[PDB]
Design a protein around this ligand. Structure first.
Ligand SMILES: OC[C@H]1O[C@@H](S[C@@H]2O[C@H](CO)[C@@H](O)[C@H](O)[C@H]2O)[C@H](O)[C@@H](n2cc(-c3cccc(F)c3)nn2)[C@H]1O
Ligand SMILES: [Cl-]
Length: 138
């Protein structure tokens, strides 16, 4: 597969109509996964499934600016399952990132970092076997 943590360059940043697809399998007994859309050292969009936060499964989304995390956005719809294959699709829309997992809409995250063409890397980390990571225009 691919080595995790994995860095996927996004040449020229992101733009509306760009679709990022991540395929992999959650490890048995996973604890956490993260996708980090990065603008240099800043994290424009952190998407962070947590499998055991006080015995609850939750997705935490946030932005990191100058090494400081901001206000978390939380989603208790939790489509991941330890040991199972998944597909994450992140569609860049004008106002938000739109995320679907296994072909079901999951959440939107409003753009806090607005220089979309500087969000030039995607980091993929945590407790997965990573099969592929790619992008296309729709
Ligand atoms: O806000 C989002 C932020 O949250 C804190 S935790 C937070 O701490 C505060 C302050 O104490 C509490 O108030 C919050 O209640 C709690 O949520 C995580 O450490 C951050 N994080 C996770 C990873 C990571 C790395 C590799 C793999 C992976 F899957 C995930 N790297 N950094 C990030 O998720
Ligand atoms: Cl975490």
């Amino acid at each position: 597969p691919l080595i995790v943590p994995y860095n996927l360059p996004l040449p020229g940043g992101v733009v509306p109509r760009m679709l990022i697809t991540i395929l992999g399998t959650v490890k048995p007994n996973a604890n956490r996964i993260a996708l980090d859309f990065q603008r240099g050292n800043d994290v424009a969009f952190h998407f962070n499934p947590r499998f055991n936060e006080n015995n609850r499964r939750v997705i935490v989304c946030n932005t990191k600016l100058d090494n400081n995390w901001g206000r978390e956005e939380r989603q208790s719809v939790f489509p991941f399952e330890s040991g199972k294959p998944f597909k994450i699709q992140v569609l860049v829309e004008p106002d938000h990132f739109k995320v679907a997992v296994n072909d079901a809409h999951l959440l939107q995250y409003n753009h806090r970092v607005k220089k979309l063409n500087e969000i030039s890397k995607l980091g993929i980390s945590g407790d997965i076997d990573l099969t592929s990571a790619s992008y296309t225009m729709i």
